[PDB]
Amino acid sequence: GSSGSSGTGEKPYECSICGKSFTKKSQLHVHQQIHTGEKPSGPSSG
Ligand SMILES: [Zn+2]
């Protein structure tokens, strides 16, 4: 978070991966795609 305009009511749809926000659910759905690369898992499970 940040110290400034806290406690306002950011868009109803806010990404958790990056932290972006979207006023249209759909937008978020498609956006999430952008996060189809970086993975928390290092080694490829067998
Ligand atoms: Zn995101």
Swiss-Prot record:
Zinc finger C2H2-type: from-to: 13-35
Chain ranges passing through the membrane: none
Subcellular location: Nucleus
Domain of life: Eukaryota
Family from the record: Belongs to the krueppel C2H2-type zinc-finger protein family.
Chain's role: May be involved in transcriptional regulation.
Protein name: Zinc finger protein 484
Source organism of the structure: Homo sapiens (Human)
